[PDB]
């Protein structure tokens, strides 16, 4: 057939004699999208010979169909159904009143079977290895956490099996792909504090440390702009098409601000209910709350011309299509004002579900405030680890307290909903509730991973700390060699989830093995 | 206008009343090519109103034009002229007998002015640096030689300014681009001997050395097949389109054969007219002469179906177009027999001047014999360096003797001509005279570079030994980052020699600087 991946076939048979029909399609994942025309089925020329037309409907989310008489502009029937991948469905519209019935000709396939099988195979290997082994400075929990986030992004960037839950969410909500970048910012803040405390304890000067901070930030930004962003398979680089924002640029700016703050207000770690780690660093908290107030003010009060003030929405056909060019609101407006459309991201994640035409950069200028807030929460985690290193009970109690506080803030902001909160979770805007949700997840992960890996030693972090010790090499590496064999080959079927998933799992395992080889040879690159 | 790079405009005005004309074009660089149709000019409809037509003629080499009456198939006049780049020439054909005259409307540009200016600027910098400095184990000559060849290939591979003398020759003869690969094979043989002598003198076992040899050869071949050959900007790799031969594959096979021979017949270096370095290694010479006899026999006596036996020619329209699919002869036939057309090089250098349609691989199977012969001559150079290291006069005398012998052999084979010798110089076939010519050049280079750099110390090899100590990193590096900024940007004019030359010079200097940075940080990768 001609069905692409994640698409079903819908055959519409119109038995009505004197009324044409227009088939409108809306996805269930849209929040207030507009109905779009799917197919036009004419009237039946003679009784007993119904006119037909075929359309392809997406199967990732539920579908809502509305059949409207193209003359009277009225609705004859409306269906809400969830079509399955590669299915063959027939819809019959006939008199006696008009009622339209949906039937299944060919059953669909189970498209999530590769994911279920890949999890069971992975779980079966873990049990065998653990059972087989039974018969036979540098914190390791932070390396394990960073390596977990690394393995996840390599799977996600390489495609994720072309599954919708291993991709970035269109506008609002969370998928597996939306977790890894905030966790990298969190871990990078924690490592900022650990490194700076060690260096300033060895007696090193603050000005040489400042020089190292500036050099590392400049180097990260330059690598991001020149190596990671461009698609050089298209052609040589021209300035008018250069994308200035990006991932490594975000890390460089966040690292500079947070590292310079910590260096400026650095204090020796002194040697048990006490708020020492919090109150000893109150100037940072004051400045961070000032930045958070700035983000809220610019997001909810800045007037954007030709756009509602405080608009938190995708534009396109979203919000009933009233604001087709307002993708982002104040964040997008500031990006376009300072950098320009041609220096932004040309394929925002909302372009597929909301059909937005403007350029929006997820790593823009306004979200760097919340990137800095995430990194500073990571710094607080490092402070807990170092201040109370003698007592494990103190560390676990503080991690639990922070996780609970940030979780309650996220519940209040998002209202435990995807689109109906006061500040819904959104990776494109780097929302406040995005930061608090992912920070509570990071504190819970550290809560589980600290006693298991560091205190007791029940686990060593294998195989996660091998890329966790070469994160920058693995990141820049898979960006450079994304199209190379063995990370990518020509598939017998591009429309198969099984083949894409196998390819991406193999490539991710190859990067874990490359990082293990570098670790085994004691080759560690720090930017 | 619409002239591309290295093209002139030819306007033909036909004043003849009753005879059409057909304009045939042949290049002077062709050996026995066929005339190709350039443009068809009809007859003049009325006296005093001559019909005209415009054609673009290449300006890299001389042009031969033949005007033939399209009815009687006779020749009215024939011109041999050398058109200049971007010139505007008008050719008038008129009665009184018929004589055709060539006139220059717009003068051409001097297309080699950027090359002349780039040499003077380079020479002016050398004089300033040498004058300014005046006011203010590992052989260095081998590193300088390898670095010179490295700088040359990086300039050549990146385009060479799009100059025809910085590209590979079409079939026969030499350009600057055809010198660098044989010199790498020569230096690699010399380094084989130096390394093996040192290791076997330190008492290391021969079997562990054999393991190291096999590992290095396998690794070189794998890197060549997977990283260097494919164009991943086109798409993911499929087996049916994989090119098996290549540069690093050639180096791997040559290294394995030569290193295993030297290891097998290794002898300690003993401590002055004597042939000790030659006669102490007579088994290698016997085996090398046997391989050379094999190459000559398979090249001049193997019967290729549908092809003359011992054909040393490009096919295409060459040799008067009698053998359009015989590109290569026995070498190409063996390549196609063993590997197949779809696993060979799809754009041989002859495809532009001789219009060949078949696939030919310059790094094929039959030329590896001559690659091994070149590497073994390099081994002989290393033997001279180590046997007579005490006496500089002995080293210089032996280098001069070898250069003279190989030069005389090259003169005898090529007959001091491009196409008229018994075995003309040809990089595609890796001819015997190609090997002897480039070996005499390498021996002369070593003759000049040994007393200057090593014995006296007048020069240190700057800036050439910095990439000479990281050759593999520089090679694989510029292959991976060929399309990246700052090595390539979008030009304001793609048809300008000045802009291409500036871009390629800047990229080559950047690779010298990268290698200097690695040397300054003591980071050396040996494959
Ligand atoms: C959304 C998607 O799918 S793609 C988006 C995802 N983006 C990315 O993954 C970007 C890639 N980013 C990264 O890999 C990292 O965040 C980096 C490169 C910015 C660095 O993060 P960091 O945690 O700071 O890494 P790094 O190892 O360089 O840490 C630097 C310092 O921390 C120290 N450190 C790191 N881990 C630890 C640890 N566990 N304990 C103690 N010190 C540590 C290092 O010793 C070093 O200190 P030093 O230089 O004084 O000796
Ligand atoms: C046609 C075009 O335009 S493109 C075609 C051009 N192709 C290429 O350039 C291919 C690239 N090839 C190369 O760079 C090289 O030929 C290579 C990578 C194959 C290696 O060549 P080599 O000269 O053998 O390089 P390398 O430095 O690795 O030498 C290996 C050994 O020689 C030793 N060695 C190298 N130079 C010297 C020296 N001057 N003195 C003593 N020992 C030396 C090294 O110590 C090493 O020994 P070890 O491993 O026991 O310690
Ligand atoms: C299909 O027809 C229905 C009519 O039942 C349309 O629904 C109305 O649309 C108008 C706008 O033209 C609104 O003012 C009404 O409030 C809607 N509801 C009713 C009950 O009339 C619907 O818009 C049509 N579909 C499309 C895509 O235009
Ligand atoms: C979906 O199913 C219908 C049957 O329910 C298929 O329609 C048949 O198509 C074949 C060839 O196209 C005809 O020979 C049959 O007569 C059709 N049957 C009916 C009942 O119409 C349709 O082809 C299927 N679509 C697919 C498989 O893509
Ligand atoms: C142009 O015309 C000339 C005639 O002077 C052709 O030259 C002859 O070509 C025939 C082949 O058809 C040969 O047998 C003759 O030996 C050639 N020379 C002479 C003096 O007759 C020439 O081939 C024509 N050009 C092209 C491209 O066909
Ligand atoms: C080459 O030179 C001729 C003149 O020798 C140019 O022909 C002139 O073209 C312009 C515009 O096309 C006319 O206005 C003139 O009348 C033409 N002059 C003659 C004598 O024919 C021709 O355009 C030039 N070709 C280029 C510059 O590409
Ligand atoms: C001090 C901390 C808590 C907050 C810092 C940010 C404050 C001072 C700034 C940031 C952006 C500012 C807003 C920007 C633009 C407008 C629109 C204008 O028509 C009225 C003022 C108003 C609404 C500003 C109010 C003050 C504001 C919210
Ligand atoms: C011993 C050294 C000097 C030479 C080794 C190669 C010799 C033995 C081999 C290599 C290829 C061989 C040739 C391959 C094919 C043919 C065509 C056939 O119709 C007659 C024999 C003839 C002409 C062979 C003669 C011998 C030959 C030249
Ligand atoms: C998110 C899915 C990724 C699937 C691959 C996970 C990593 C598998 C590890 C394989 C390599 C192990 C090398 C280290 C062994 C000690
Ligand atoms: C074949 C033309 C290439 C032009 C560039 C030649 C190399 C220039 C050297 C510049 C970098 C010097 C770095 C080392 C300085 C000590
Ligand atoms: C249905 O559409 C056709 C166009 O092909 C039109 O001619 C016809 O009038 C329409 N039906 C009605 C009832 O108007
Ligand atoms: C020249 O070519 C034309 C085709 O356009 C043809 O009609 C004419 O006959 C030819 N000239 C002669 C002399 O045959
Ligand atoms: C490396 C191993 C990769 C395993 C992935 C399994 C893919 C799912 C197969 C589903 C079969 C229907
Ligand atoms: C898609 C909607 C996301 C809302 C998430 C709300 C929960 C925030 C964290 C809850 C506690 C986490 C403990 C691990
Ligand atoms: C000692 C070396 C100093 C290098 C300085 C390079 C420029 C630093 C700029 C960093 C700015 C990043 C945040 C905007
Ligand atoms: C005495 C040693 C000092 C070394 C340099 C430290 C100062 C670096 C300044 C960089 C500031 C960056 C601002 C963009
Ligand atoms: C050992 C000397 C300490 C003196 C204070 C050092 C403060 C360094 C932070 C400066 C922040 C400014 C960034 C541009
Ligand atoms: C030297 C001690 C002074 C105490 C100042 C008050 C500390 C305020 C801490 C702010 C934390 C609020 C966000 C968690
Ligand atoms: C001594 C510490 C023993 C391990 C305690 C682990 C606590 C993790 C809690 C996770 C809750 C789901
Ligand atoms: C690096 C410096 C590159 C110099 C190359 C000069 C190009 C030739 C210029 C010709 C002007 C007409
Ligand atoms: C294009 C024709 C090439 C023929 C070259 C013949 C000369 C061979 C070497 C001569 C002596 C070299 C001394 C440096
Ligand atoms: C000790 C490690 C040995 C590795 C062996 C790898 C295979 C070697 C094959 C090399 C063949 C190259 C010439 C055909
Ligand atoms: C005792 C140590 C021996 C180490 C291995 C040496 C033998 C390697 C054999 C490789 C041969 C390659 C042939 C293709
Ligand atoms: C120290 C032991 C020496 C014994 C002889 C070693 C010979 C090694 C060369 C073998 C060549 C075979 C390659 C496949
Ligand atoms: C002691 C050696 C002095 C230097 C001798 C250089 C010989 C090079 C000859 C080059 C001929 C053109
Ligand atoms: C800070 C690094 C900025 C790098 C900008 C690259 C610009 C490329 C344009 C060159 C082609 C005209
Ligand atoms: C057609 C699929 C073949 C590729 C399988 C994945 C590669 C695994 C080995 C990689 C080591 C170089
Ligand atoms: C010795 C290394 C050989 C590598 C061959 C790569 C083959 C790639 C084809 C996979 C896609 C079907
Ligand atoms: C438009 C041309 C601008 C590029 C000039 C070459 C780059 C030189 C600096 C490279 C260092 C990153
Ligand atoms: C999704 C987990 C898959 C684990 C596969 C591990 C074998 C390479
Ligand atoms: C590092 C060089 C940047 C050059 C930018 C030029 C913009 C047209
Ligand atoms: C003790 C110094 C505090 C300086 C003010 C903090 C906010 C800028
Ligand atoms: C502005 C409405 C309430 C916001 C929730 C507060 C969470 C701390
Ligand atoms: C310092 C620039 C990045 C180097 C490329 C690394 C590719 C794995
Ligand atoms: C062809 C030699 C040019 C030398 C230029 C050196 C300055 C980068
Ligand atoms: C290294 C894996 C090679 C796989 C080759 C498969 C040919 C179709
Ligand atoms: C002294 C051993 C020589 C072995 C024969 C050489 C040619 C195979
Ligand atoms: C076979 C004709 C003569 C070949 C020249 C010999 C050079 C040593
Ligand atoms: C070992 C494979 C090659 C690594 C890439 C190096 C790029 C500079």
Tab-separated table of C-alpha atoms and ligand atoms in Angstrom, chain A residues 218 221-222 225-226 237-240 242, chain B residues 485 489-490, ligand 26:
chain	number	residue	atom	x	y	z
A	218	UNK	CA	33.778	30.506	25.415
A	221	UNK	CA	29.679	28.319	22.879
A	222	UNK	CA	32.087	28.164	19.924
A	225	UNK	CA	27.819	27.332	17.000
A	226	UNK	CA	30.392	25.905	14.593
A	237	UNK	CA	28.087	27.820	5.945
A	238	UNK	CA	26.753	31.311	5.235
A	239	UNK	CA	26.196	33.917	7.930
A	240	UNK	CA	22.607	34.745	7.003
A	242	UNK	CA	23.619	30.627	10.947
B	485	UNK	CA	33.704	25.940	8.960
B	489	UNK	CA	32.292	28.764	3.737
B	490	UNK	CA	29.904	30.045	1.087
C	26	LIG	C1	31.811	32.937	18.192
C	26	LIG	C2	31.893	32.066	16.947
C	26	LIG	C3	31.095	32.639	15.782
C	26	LIG	C4	31.236	31.849	14.488
C	26	LIG	C5	30.410	32.442	13.354
C	26	LIG	C6	30.571	31.713	12.029
C	26	LIG	C7	30.132	32.553	10.839
C	26	LIG	C8	30.243	31.823	9.510
C	26	LIG	C9	29.950	32.712	8.312
C	26	LIG	C10	31.054	32.707	7.268
C	26	LIG	C11	30.538	32.630	5.838
C	26	LIG	C12	30.208	33.987	5.236
